[PDB]
Design a protein around this ligand. Structure first.
Ligand SMILES: Nc1ncnc2c1ncn2[C@@H]1O[C@H](COP(=O)(O)OP(=O)(O)OP(=O)(O)O)[C@@H](O)[C@H]1O
Ligand SMILES: Nc1ncnc2c1ncn2[C@@H]1O[C@H](COP(=O)(O)OP(=O)(O)O)[C@@H](O)[C@H]1O
Ligand SMILES: [Mg+2]
Ligand SMILES: [Mg+2]
Lengths: 384, 371, 371
């Protein structure tokens, strides 16, 4: 008998508390308690619904035709985009037309190109004939955008000039660092004397074997200096060489001074920035050709900046060609063929070896400092 | 109808009307209870001070924070915080105003159920919304994509988001923020002989953390400068008239944000947490995220955090692509500013959570509606 | 004299004597250093802890797992692990026991040369032989020719073997193993609703992977009954009281071995790398490759992996209805047990590398005796 289900409907709205459900077929099993509860002989306690309805009930007893041709999501994104400028959209269409770069970085122009008007949207805006004030801020911004002749070309000039300036200021000091790196690698002063000391100790060590009696090595042998460990497994060969060089010939301690421009390597891949620079120069040439087909206002707005960008990227391509020529010189310098990676492997090699030089210097200084401290402690315990 | 934006943060509750630039009611979230006895009969000796009255009368009060590590622990206190910020500060009826609310990422679901049921059953509203704090912090910056690091009072969490799509797996959370820096400042101030043990003194240590502390650009050079010369020592006047002078503690206190081993945590600094957040994303969208690092929360008010953060990210990441830090001066209220931007839109009228939706779907439609 | 066999594992280094049924020492591949600063005396506390001692005191220790994906990168910590493995775990000196060793397949040649020169110069063993883990894994089953799937904690490989000699051209690599399965298991249990940020939670999920997870005979059919299976849903109790419920994920964690597109990479599975590795050999050996297919590692303890390997090789290869994939019950340590079988024999005495061979030939003897 469904005695618990027989409930009068309350006239007020009641708070809904959450709990999980069990189904009805699982409910009325014979060994379940609900076979006994559904019997009339069960002790049915009647609660006071009036006091609970006093307590736990709820205390709660234009121009919408904006005629927007967009959907909700793109209008929402364009409203978020429009509200960042803290000004009217008339000023926005003004500095789109006037050619200003102060308030437009790469991401804002990327968002603007990602919220371009579509063909049916432009057709619905042009077929519109009623009052312009009835439209949304999004549609009025699109009408102001369509009022600008060749607006997409101007936004592309904004995006490509700002991106070209950013890529030039990123790539040009690093390409100068690569040029200074390979120039200092081609002409180094104490690096022959360091190789003199290394090959003197190495030809002393591997006597009487098939690996002995050599008169040179590649630059990768500078990585293999760290693989050497002593009987204590604490002193490397590089530690012993710098410890002897600190006593005998300290000019090798000025060895990172000539090679500080090889330090930090390139840290990049040169083909990625070269492809990006070539793509940017191709896009600048295409944009200059498109502006040349456009009106003279766009010409006086953009042609000097496009020519400066094309000149700077041409100087960058000349610098890349110089990097290629010095790469061939560095391949012949270390006597390795040019088909293998002799540019990024050599810079990562030199950055790794200079970090090995700096840690070997500071660990030799720490070893001498702790030896001096232990000697002072021994003299202390001998005094006392 | 003017909506209400009410960021119920761990540190300070920031509430006001939508469509405005600055929040009207900014006040810390503490409940003060008198530990002593009353002898002076009458004059409204009310037993639980909430808000700025707890701040002003703090010398006789035990202060309890209802929010601990971005989790609403004490619920009666947090209801008193909501009652004070609706009735005493804004002085508005909740039944005639929508109320935007904020939340921390990776929150428990039953926590959202509980705030939804208090915001629909006790304080009845026509509509309300729950949003991620980092997403509103990004919307204050006006860009659609980027990574937002938010360091509140209990949580420093990283959320990268690309075109509004918040990546769930690349969100993570580090429990090291302003209260832990305050406790470490109590621990290191006893080296100079200044003792602060009471909860009343936590406001004083939080105040000197707000006023005098700053992020060092390099920790070792600032150590050598502080050890060499006493040029960086700064004085503070206590409310009892005593004047203290602190030295290296101006930069040893935010350095826990970059070195969590000071307070004894195995996890790395916020730069490494940002980096590991970036590697969890897809490799194509990382270029957008590296140039769009957005700070929010008042723990980024230290005036050396941007250049040090740029240095740490540029050192740790590969240097191929652009590193740019977005640190607006009003990023302390960027959660509230982004809520005011989001609440005042014509498209937002259909993402409101109405009373009828609550009656249909319990306090559970916020899971399937919001992210 | 009895010989020593050690499996230098990515997640578990095992060590013991030749002829034993089980390895005497099983310890994780960890090196611990003290996490906080502090010196005192404390009755001579050790500067570095390794293995079970590092596992036992691991709260005050930062750990290092120095093998990355089967391949050795940090060499000093391997030297410390080998010093623990001889001098304290088995309590031996390595200059009189011949020592069998294990390598990951497709090992770099400089790693093998460095391994041999550290065995001969530092430890000064009188005899050492490097074997691929798959060749020892075939030796535990007791045959000399065939392809073997070996998935440990670092990396998955399929290696063909001819008369005890491996073919390095047709060895194939799949970039997942039990560590990657453990990471994926934390990922989909986090998607189920849990969170594992601590050390002990990761060890509990490792023991969940040890106990509950299995491979079904059919993935699609067991998906088809996944909501309706009364026996699929298992659970586990953490000792502080947390309950972890696992359902279909019990056969989604190891099926990453069969289909690596579950996690988001397009690499071939443990049956597909096996099939492609069989076709890259000479044609004559391929029936012997199918006839002696042995799975090995702790990543093959999932029950019902044998009949699923049977069904997948049945699907790819129409000639393999009736040939059975051999799954020993002790193929946790089949690398070690096959090393015990190989080193304990009296036919292996010629194949050891002497000290004089390294002295006259250089380290490159590891290219030419171990093949
Ligand atoms: N019973 C089990 N069921 C499932 N997984 C297990 C079981 N026991 C151990 N594992 C897991 O499998 C791995 C152990 O496999 P194994 O001992 O072969 O690895 P390893 O030797 O360290 O690796 P590698 O051979 O790549 O060097 C670990 O990731 C461990 O967590
Ligand atoms: N000017 C300041 N300088 C340094 N720290 C500040 C400053 N103002 C506030 N803070 C710190 O940042 C926090 C600001 O709180 P907020 O981020 O607005 O909310 P919550 O942290 O409660 O989520 C406070 O706890 C305070 O410790
Ligand atoms: Mg906050
Ligand atoms: Mg192993």
């Amino acid at each position: 008998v469904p005695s618990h289900r027989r409930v009068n409907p309350p006239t007020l709205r009641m708070k809904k508390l959450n709990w999980q459900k069990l189904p009805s077929n699982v409910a009325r099993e014979h060994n379940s308690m609900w076979a006994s509860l559904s019997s009339p002989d069960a002790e049915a306690v009647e609660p006071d619904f009036s006091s609970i309805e006093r307590l736990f009930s709820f205390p709660a007893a234009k121009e919408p035709k904006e005629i927007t041709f967009l959907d909700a999501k793109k209008s929402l994104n364009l409203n978020i985009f429009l509200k960042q400028f803290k000004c009217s959209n008339e000023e926005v269409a003004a500095m789109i037309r006037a050619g200003d770069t102060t308030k437009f970085d790469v991401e804002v122009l990327k968002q603007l190109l990602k919220l371009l008007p579509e063909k049916h949207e432009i057709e619905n805006l042009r077929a519109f004939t009623e009052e312009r004030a009835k439209l949304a801020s999004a549609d009025h911004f699109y009408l102001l955008l369509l009022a600008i002749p060749c607006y997409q070309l101007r936004i592309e000039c904004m995006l490509l000039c700002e991106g070209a300036a950013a890529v030039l200021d990123m790539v040009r000091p690093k390409a100068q660092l690569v040029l200074a790196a390979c120039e200092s690698l081609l002409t180094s002063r104490q690096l022959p004397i360091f190789c003199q000391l290394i090959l003197r100790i190495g030809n002393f060590l591997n006597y009487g074997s098939h690996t002995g009696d050599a008169d040179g090595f590649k630059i990768s042998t500078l990585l293999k200096l760290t693989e050497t460990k002593s009987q204590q497994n604490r002193v490397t060969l590089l530690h012993h060489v710098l410890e002897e060089a600190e006593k005998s010939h300290p000019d090798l301690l000025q060895l990172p001074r000539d090679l500080e421009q090889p330090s930090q390597a390139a840290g990049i891949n040169l083909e990625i920035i070269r492809s990006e620079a070539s793509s940017n120069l191709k896009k600048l040439l295409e944009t200059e050709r498109k502006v040349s087909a456009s009106v003279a206002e766009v010409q006086e707005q953009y042609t000097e900046r496009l020519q400066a960008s094309i000149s700077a990227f041409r100087a960058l391509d000349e610098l890349f060609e110089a990097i290629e020529q010095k790469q061939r010189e560095l391949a012949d310098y270390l006597c390795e063929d040019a088909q293998q990676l002799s540019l990024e492997d050599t810079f990562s090699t030199m950055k790794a070896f200079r970090d090995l030089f700096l840690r070997a210097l500071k660990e030799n200084k720490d070893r001498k400092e702790q030896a001096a401290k232990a000697e002072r402690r021994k003299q202390q315990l001998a005094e006392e | 109808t003017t909506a209400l934006v009410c960021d119920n943060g761990s540190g300070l509750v920031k509430a006001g009307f939508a469509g405005d630039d600055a929040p009207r009611a900014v006040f810390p979230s503490i409940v003060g209870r008198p530990r002593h006895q009353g002898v002076m009969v009458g004059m409204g000796q009310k037993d639980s001070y909430v808000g700025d009255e707890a701040q002003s009368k703090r010398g006789i009060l035990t202060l309890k924070y209802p929010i601990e590590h971005g989790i609403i622990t004490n619920w009666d206190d947090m209801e008193k915080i909501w009652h004070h910020t609706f009735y005493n500060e804004l002085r508005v009826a909740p039944e005639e105003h929508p109320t935007l609310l904020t939340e921390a990422p990776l929150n428990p679901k039953a926590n959202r159920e509980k705030m939804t049921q208090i915001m629909f059953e006790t304080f009845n509203v026509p509509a309300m919304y729950v949003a991620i704090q980092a997403v509103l912090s990004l919307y204050a910056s006006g860009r659609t994509t980027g990574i937002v690091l938010d360091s509140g009072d209990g949580v420093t969490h990283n959320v990268p988001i690309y075109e509004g799509y918040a990546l769930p797996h690349a969100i993570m959370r580090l429990d090291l923020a302003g209260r832990d820096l305050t406790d470490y400042l109590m621990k290191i101030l006893t080296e100079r002989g200044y003792s602060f043990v009471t909860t009343a003194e936590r406001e004083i240590v939080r105040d000197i953390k707000e006023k005098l502390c700053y992020v060092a650009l390099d920790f070792e050079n600032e150590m050598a400068t502080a050890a060499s010369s006493s040029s960086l020592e700064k004085s503070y006047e206590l409310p009892d008239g005593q004047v203290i002078t602190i030295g290296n503690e101006r930069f040893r206190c935010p350095e826990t944000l970059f070195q969590p081993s000071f307070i004894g945590m195995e996890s790395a600094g916020i730069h490494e947490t940002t980096y590991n957040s970036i590697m969890k994303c897809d490799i194509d969208i990382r270029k957008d995220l590296y140039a769009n690092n957005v700070m929010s929360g008042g723990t980024t008010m230290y005036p050396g955090i941007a250049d040090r953060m740029q240095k740490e990210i540029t050192a740790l990441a590969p240097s191929t692509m652009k590193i740019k830090i977005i640190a607006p001066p009003e990023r302390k209220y960027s959660v509230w500013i982004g809520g005011s931007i989001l609440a005042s839109l014509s498209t937002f009228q259909q993402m409101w959570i109405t009373k009828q939706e609550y009656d249909e779907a319990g306090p559970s439609i916020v899971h399937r509606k919001c992210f």
